[PDB]
Design a binder for this molecule. Structure first.
Ligand code: CA
Ligand code: CA
Ligand code: CA
Ligand code: CA
Lengths: 26, 148
């Protein structure tokens, strides 16, 4: 219905794949 | 006993039916690139494929249902990294105020690839607000998504 979840979760998947990059400090 | 649940399972599923625009149902450099690109641009491809291998246990180079569920169920109580939820928020609040507006979201929801008039969202934001401000803040955003 008004679940910002599927919307949030979804972005959470991609957002997580962007942070998964364990700090490319080097 | 629990066979009558499938509530959470159904939720992830919808996320895959929404994120996967092709029809396979797997997070790949393709669905990731397309979306991630329409969200924050996309640098190179080799980096994306390498980032997916650093997590893909099997090697299919992609993710299915068990692996996804596992990506979330597999966890470490390790200090809450709200940085994730936080970042997710920043994406929603494009400008940089902190609260969500009717127009703001409409732009983020309309860009996802679907059609949501101004009425729907309006009714969504409304219900999200329990006090009576009209806009969604951080407290209401946490109090609504946090449930445990
Ligand atoms: Ca796919
Ligand atoms: Ca896999
Ligand atoms: Ca804003
Ligand atoms: Ca409010």
């Amino acid at each position: 219905k008004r679940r910002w979840k599927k919307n949030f979760i979804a972005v959470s998947a991609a957002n997580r794949f962007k942070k998964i990059s364990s700090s490319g400090a080097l | 006993a629990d066979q009558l649940t499938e509530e959470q399972i159904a939720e992830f599923k919808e996320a895959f039916s929404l994120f996967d625009k092709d029809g396979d149902g797997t997070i790949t450099t393709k669905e990731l690139g397309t979306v991630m690109r329409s969200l924050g641009q996309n640098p190179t491809e080799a980096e994306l494929q390498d980032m997916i291998n650093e997590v893909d246990a099997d090697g299919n180079g992609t993710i299915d249902f068990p692996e996804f569920l596992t990506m979330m169920a597999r966890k470490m109580k390790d200090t809450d990294s709200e940085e994730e939820i936080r970042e997710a928020f920043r994406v929603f609040d494009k400008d940089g105020n902190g609260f969500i507006s009717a127009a703001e979201l409409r732009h983020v929801m309309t860009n996802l690839g679907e059609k949501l008039t101004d009425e729907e969202v309006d009714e969504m934001i409304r219900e999200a607000d329990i006090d009576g401000d009209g806009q969604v803040n951080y407290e209401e955003f946490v109090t609504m998504m946090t449930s445990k």
